[PDB]
Amino acid sequence: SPVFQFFDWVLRGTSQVMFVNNPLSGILIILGLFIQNPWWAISGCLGTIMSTLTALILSQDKSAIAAGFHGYNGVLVGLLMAVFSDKGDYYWWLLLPVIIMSMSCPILSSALGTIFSKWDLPVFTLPFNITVTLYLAATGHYNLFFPTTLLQPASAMPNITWSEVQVPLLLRAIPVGIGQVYGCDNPWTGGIFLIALFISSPLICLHAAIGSTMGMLAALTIATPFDSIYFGLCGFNSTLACIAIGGMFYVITWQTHLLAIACALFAAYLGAALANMLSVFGLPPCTWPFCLSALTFLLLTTNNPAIYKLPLSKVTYPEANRIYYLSQ
Amino acid sequence: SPVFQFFDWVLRGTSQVMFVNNPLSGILIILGLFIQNPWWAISGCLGTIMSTLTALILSQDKSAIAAGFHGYNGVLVGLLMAVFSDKGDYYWWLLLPVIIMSMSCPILSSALGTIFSKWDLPVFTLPFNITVTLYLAATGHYNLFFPTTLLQPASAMPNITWSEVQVPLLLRAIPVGIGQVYGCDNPWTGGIFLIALFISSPLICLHAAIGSTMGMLAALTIATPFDSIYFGLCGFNSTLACIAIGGMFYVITWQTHLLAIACALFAAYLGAALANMLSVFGLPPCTWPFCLSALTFLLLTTNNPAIYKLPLSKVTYPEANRIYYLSQ
Amino acid sequence: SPVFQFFDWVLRGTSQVMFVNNPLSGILIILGLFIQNPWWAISGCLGTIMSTLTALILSQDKSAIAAGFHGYNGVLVGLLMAVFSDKGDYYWWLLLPVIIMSMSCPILSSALGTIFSKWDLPVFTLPFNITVTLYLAATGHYNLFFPTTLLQPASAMPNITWSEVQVPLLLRAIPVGIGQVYGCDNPWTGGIFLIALFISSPLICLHAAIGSTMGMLAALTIATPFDSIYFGLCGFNSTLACIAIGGMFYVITWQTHLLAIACALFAAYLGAALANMLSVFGLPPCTWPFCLSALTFLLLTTNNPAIYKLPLSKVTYPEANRIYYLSQ
Numbered sequence: 005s006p007v008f009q010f011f012d013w014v015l016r017g018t019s020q021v022m023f024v025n026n027p028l029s030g031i032l033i034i035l036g037l038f039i040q041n042p043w044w045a046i047s048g049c050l051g052t053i054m055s056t057l058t059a060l061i062l063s064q065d066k067s068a069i070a071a072g073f074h075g076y077n078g079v080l081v082g083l084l085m086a087v088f089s090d091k092g093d094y095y096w097w098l099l100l101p102v103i104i105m106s107m108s109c110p111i112l113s114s115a116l117g118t119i120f121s122k123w124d125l126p127v128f129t130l131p132f133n134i135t136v137t138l139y140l141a142a143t144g145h146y147n148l149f150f151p152t153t154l155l156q157p158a159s160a161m162p163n164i165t166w167s168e169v170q171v172p173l174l175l176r177a178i179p180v181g182i183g184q185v186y187g188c189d190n191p192w193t194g195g196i197f198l199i200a201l202f203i204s205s206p207l208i209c210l211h212a213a214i215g216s217t218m219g220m221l222a223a224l225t226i227a228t229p230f231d232s233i234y235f236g237l238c239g240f241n242s243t244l245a246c247i248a249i250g251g252m253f254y255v256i257t258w259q260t261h262l263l264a265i266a267c268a269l270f271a272a273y274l275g276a277a278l279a280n281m282l283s284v285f286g287l288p289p290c291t292w293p294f295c296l297s298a299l300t301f302l303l304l305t306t307n308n309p310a311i312y313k314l315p316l317s318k319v320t321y322p323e324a325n326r327i328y329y330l331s332q
Numbered sequence: 333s334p335v336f337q338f339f340d341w342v343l344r345g346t347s348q349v350m351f352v353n354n355p356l357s358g359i360l361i362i363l364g365l366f367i368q369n370p371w372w373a374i375s376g377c378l379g380t381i382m383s384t385l386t387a388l389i390l391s392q393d394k395s396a397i398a399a400g401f402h403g404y405n406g407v408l409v410g411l412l413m414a415v416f417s418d419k420g421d422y423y424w425w426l427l428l429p430v431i432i433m434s435m436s437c438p439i440l441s442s443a444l445g446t447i448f449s450k451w452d453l454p455v456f457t458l459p460f461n462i463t464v465t466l467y468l469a470a471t472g473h474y475n476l477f478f479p480t481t482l483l484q485p486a487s488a489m490p491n492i493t494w495s496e497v498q499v500p501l502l503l504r505a506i507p508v509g510i511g512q513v514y515g516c517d518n519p520w521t522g523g524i525f526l527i528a529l530f531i532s533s534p535l536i537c538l539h540a541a542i543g544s545t546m547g548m549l550a551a552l553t554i555a556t557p558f559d560s561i562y563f564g565l566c567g568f569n570s571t572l573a574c575i576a577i578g579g580m581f582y583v584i585t586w587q588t589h590l591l592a593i594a595c596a597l598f599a600a601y602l603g604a605a606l607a608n609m610l611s612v613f614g615l616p617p618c619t620w621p622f623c624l625s626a627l628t629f630l631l632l633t634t635n636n637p638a639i640y641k642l643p644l645s646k647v648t649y650p651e652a653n654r655i656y657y658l659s660q
Numbered sequence: 661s662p663v664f665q666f667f668d669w670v671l672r673g674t675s676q677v678m679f680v681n682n683p684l685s686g687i688l689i690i691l692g693l694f695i696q697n698p699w700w701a702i703s704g705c706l707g708t709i710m711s712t713l714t715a716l717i718l719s720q721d722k723s724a725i726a727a728g729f730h731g732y733n734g735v736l737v738g739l740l741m742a743v744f745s746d747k748g749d750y751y752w753w754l755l756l757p758v759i760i761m762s763m764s765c766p767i768l769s770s771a772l773g774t775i776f777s778k779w780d781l782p783v784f785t786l787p788f789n790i791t792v793t794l795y796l797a798a799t800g801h802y803n804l805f806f807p808t809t810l811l812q813p814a815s816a817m818p819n820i821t822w823s824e825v826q827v828p829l830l831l832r833a834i835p836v837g838i839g840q841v842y843g844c845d846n847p848w849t850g851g852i853f854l855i856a857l858f859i860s861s862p863l864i865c866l867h868a869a870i871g872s873t874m875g876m877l878a879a880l881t882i883a884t885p886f887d888s889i890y891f892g893l894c895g896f897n898s899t900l901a902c903i904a905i906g907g908m909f910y911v912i913t914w915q916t917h918l919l920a921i922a923c924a925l926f927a928a929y930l931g932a933a934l935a936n937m938l939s940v941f942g943l944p945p946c947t948w949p950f951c952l953s954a955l956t957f958l959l960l961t962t963n964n965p966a967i968y969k970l971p972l973s974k975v976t977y978p979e980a981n982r983i984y985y986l987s988q
């Protein structure tokens with residue numbers, strides 16, 4: 005029956021946000037989202053369903069849809085449209101734009117696909133960034149139908165007293181950091197996401213934890229206010245970069261491990277920079293630093309024989325990549 | 333005599349703004365411009381003449397100049413320099429910068445030509461955008477020689493009463509929308525431009541009207557203030573995108589018709605977004621959304637056999653493209 | 661002994677800022693920097709040393725390192741980090757970020773190298789611009805550890821009285837203009853830099869002087885305040901563009917001479933534009949106009965046989981390029 009295949013496709017698309025291709029992980033992710041806020045989960049599921057349907061209508065490649073590559077952008081756009089909303093919970097009209105902008109994810113992810121194929125690179129999360137920035141800038145806070153929350157550039161020297169830092173929450177910032185990938189801020193959903201990652205491949209989970217820790221440490225060297233670190237907004241760009249560079253697109257080796265740690269640090273600093281720059285327009289920084297940093301560390305060329313870049317036709321998950329590299 | 337050939341070249345360059353290659357259409361366009369404001373027409377004609385002469389001096393391709401591809405950027409830069417001016421009518425010194433910046437149109441349109449040729453794409457209007465943004469940002473409002481008018485970001489929630497909407501002007505917004513391509517705002521010049529388009533090819537005229545209507549409708553779903561819609565600033569980016577995607581660069585078919593309508597809607601929303609974003613610097617959004625949207629819908633690849641993309645060496649006008657596709 | 665070779669490498673890297681490859685020129689540059697401000701020289705030397713060491717560790721091409729192509733970005737990032745600092749002279753903690761960001765110069769200059777090689781173009785100064793913009797935006801003025809100085813957009817109509825212009829300083833603006841390439845503002849260091857350039861190749865020195873004069877003249881046509889022209893900030897982007905286009909990457913001929921002068925003028929106007937635009941974020945414009953203008957005048961294609969573009973594998977310095985072109 006086609007319907008079961010379709011729902012398998014949407015589950016895989018939901019799972020594919022953190023480079024994991026497994027329906028059980030998708031079920032766990034949906035359970036975590038419903039633990040967080042039901043309205044956000046509804047918006048995300050609607051977004052991914054509509055994105056997959058539009059991709060099917062435009063008749064792109066069959067294997068790509070069957071693997072879920074076309075569904076991991078709808079869930080993010082739905083969740084981030086439901087988060088930055090001033091109307092509150094259960095504002096049904098918000099479901100109208102979610103249908104429209106989701107349709108723009110299959111198109112853009114195809115267009116960039118023609119440009120990046122020359123250098124054999126992936127289209128990481130650029131369509132989601134473009135669509136969400138477009139919508140948030142088009143609506144604005146002073147809108148009569150879909151108002152947005154306020155972001156404003158800093159105006160005075162922050163007040164920090166180092167005698168009040170609390171180690172408990174500083175350590176706690178890791179699960180919240182890994183949970184903030186989907187926009188959630190509860191420790192429980194962070195733990196559930198960690199379990200869902202670990203079910204499929206341990207290496208991804210370990211690298212996500214290391215990246216979150218790197219992001220949290222990197223923000224204490226420029227005197228970031230403690231509230232941002234506690235909330236976890238300073239460590240959700242590092243995890244994705246660390247996962248992408250560490251084991252997936254490079255064959256795993258200790259040199260690539262160090263390179264991934266460097267990627268996490270660079271992503272964190274670029275994230276701070278873009279967060280301060282984009283605050284003038286009133287827009288938030290969302291997965292721009294990860295895209296730029298991951299793209300700039302996959303174009304580097306070295307003569308060291310241990311840093312091997314896999315072709316895009318074979319990347320499945322780190323252990324399989326290792327065995328494939330060793331076999332031939 | 334060379335002089336007659338030269339004036340034929342400038343007339344074709346003037347006509348080429350709306351993808352039409354015919355001297356009679358150019359005469360009609362000039363008549364409309366002189367109906368609007370004589371000073372603006374003088375500036376535009378000077379710009380196109382200087383741009384064509386510079387292109388001839390740099391010795392680019394002969395056929396391109398003879399077809400007018402090098403003259404459709406000077407007229408726009410001249411008109412938009414004459415529009416955003418605070419000194420008033422008949423400020424002769426303004427003719428000095430117009431000579432200089434026009435010379436920068438043949439250069440840029442060549443440079444981008446080397447980059448885009450890899451993927452076989454056109455350089456739609458990027459040189460005009462780059463030059464005008466450069467000039468407007470360099471001068472600024474607080475200038476002692478060439479001051480500019482004021483644009484400022486919104487600061488308070490707009491006041492809209494839906495009981496005062498007037499259907500007459502809302503319907504009227506279509507001819508003004510098609511006339512705003514050259515910067516004019518009079519219904520009479522809009523009608524004249526429509527006639528000039530219809531003389532050469534009916535399909536272009538029909539698609540321009542449909543695109544203008546789409547742009548006008550798309551702005552009522554985000555509560556745009558009525559003055560902008562009445563003035564026609566919300567429907568001059570959609571017409572160009574609809575014309576470009578509908579019949580010119582794709583073989584005409586109902587699938588491409590729907591794709592062109594989608595292009596118009598996407599261009600309108602991106603136009604709103606860029607208009608709100610660029611207001612911080614004090615610059616207006618001018619033909620950026622059309623360029624980006626048209627470029628992002630010519631790189632899409634599909635397996636449907638009815639969406640055929642013509643090579644750039646054969647695009648003449650939609651009926652000829654249809655007959656050429658059917659013949660072989 | 662390897663150590664002597666290493667110090668030769670860092671000297672060549674220091675010299676390679678103005679397209680000159682000679683240790684004696686490097687010694688002269690260091691002498692000028694130490695004449696200006698010892699702290700700035702310390703920061704620059706540390707930056708170039710760390711950049712060269714990182715490039716060696718990443719194991720890039722051997723000839724490129726031996727020629728100094730990897731050391732001309734560290735000195736600039738060190739100098740510009742030492743200039744825009746509010747803490748004052750001898751703030752030792754500033755040496756910590758200088759070590760980190762310098763390590764990001766070998767990486768980026770490699771990544772862009774894979775993209776630009778398709779069209780056979782160089783990576784002029786983009787890594788330095790990216791790194792410095794990232795750091796300055798990330799820290800900001802309202803920072804608790806590394807505060808920056810303040811740049812603010814203009815708010816009122818400037819006051820200029822043409823009866824007070826002083827020809828002495830207007831003529832003086834040329835050596836200061838050529839000296840502001842490294843961030844110094846003293847006439848003596850400008851003269852020393854001019855001598856250092858002249859020792860290796862007269863053509864580079866002459867073109868630098870012509871470019872500085874062009875930049876100084878171009879700023880009096882838009883009523884720039886006199887303080888900026890006196891300080892020399894209006895003529896350090898033109899010199900680099902004139903040197904790059906005039907003799908290095910094109911075979912020297914009078915047509916290319918005129919083209920280089922045009923490049924200087926275009927770079928100056930784009931510099932004014934970017935300076936006014938980037939002031940909203942609080943960042944300064946640093947070698948962006950030179951990069952963009954030089955890149956856009958190396959992609960132009962003409963049928964004139966006298967405008968010949970050399971391959972990147974043979975560019976050494978203008979006289980050698982001339983003799984090589986004539987020989988075959």
Ligand SMILES: CC(=O)c1ccc(C(=O)Nc2cccc(NS(=O)(=O)c3ccccc3)c2)o1
Pocket residue numbers: 020021022023068073074076113114117120125126127128129316317319
């Ligand atoms: C969230 C995130 O960062 C992420 C998850 C998966 C990916 C990804 O990029 N996978 C992938 C794997 C192999 C090949 C390609 N090729 S592609 O050009 O990007 C392409 C995109 C669309 C449809 C067809 C192909 C993509 O990014």
Ligand SMILES: CC(=O)c1ccc(C(=O)Nc2cccc(NS(=O)(=O)c3ccccc3)c2)o1
Pocket residue numbers: 084154155184185186187231232235237240279288289290291
């Ligand atoms: C993966 C992705 O794209 C994503 C999901 C969620 C986010 C995100 O949350 N971005 C962000 C970054 C900075 C500030 C804000 N919001 S804030 O009002 O300024 C604020 C700052 C401090 C503490 C409370 C709230 C949001 O990004």
Ligand SMILES: CC(=O)c1ccc(C(=O)Nc2cccc(NS(=O)(=O)c3ccccc3)c2)o1
Pocket residue numbers: 348349350351396401402404441442445448453454455456457644645647
């Ligand atoms: C206003 C507008 O959007 C418009 C009108 C005409 C065009 C256009 O793009 N025509 C065209 C038709 C076929 C081939 C190319 N090739 S090109 O690279 O763009 C190129 C530009 C310069 C001189 C030589 C060639 C261009 O855009």
Ligand SMILES: CC(=O)c1ccc(C(=O)Nc2cccc(NS(=O)(=O)c3ccccc3)c2)o1
Pocket residue numbers: 412482483512513514515559560563565568607616617618619
């Ligand atoms: C084809 C092209 O490039 C072009 C020609 C003319 C325009 C144009 O008009 N852009 C634009 C867009 C938004 C606002 C303004 N001007 S305004 O002062 O803010 C204002 C807004 C509302 C009603 C009155 C005036 C101008 O673009």
Ligand SMILES: CC(=O)c1ccc(C(=O)Nc2cccc(NS(=O)(=O)c3ccccc3)c2)o1
Pocket residue numbers: 676677678679724729730732769770773781782783784785900972975
């Ligand atoms: C000071 C300044 O503006 C400047 C910029 C570039 C040069 C220069 O001399 N570039 C050059 C000369 C020959 C070959 C290449 N090739 S490259 O791909 O860009 C490449 C960059 C990195 C390391 C290896 C090679 C670059 O001077």
Ligand SMILES: CC(=O)c1ccc(C(=O)Nc2cccc(NS(=O)(=O)c3ccccc3)c2)o1
Pocket residue numbers: 736740810811840841842843887888891893896935944945946947
């Ligand atoms: C090669 C390079 O990267 C470089 C070296 C030096 C600079 C540079 O100096 N840029 C710059 C440009 C504009 C303004 C400012 N600073 S300012 O505070 O606004 C100011 C304005 C008026 C008089 C004094 C100082 C700095 O760039």
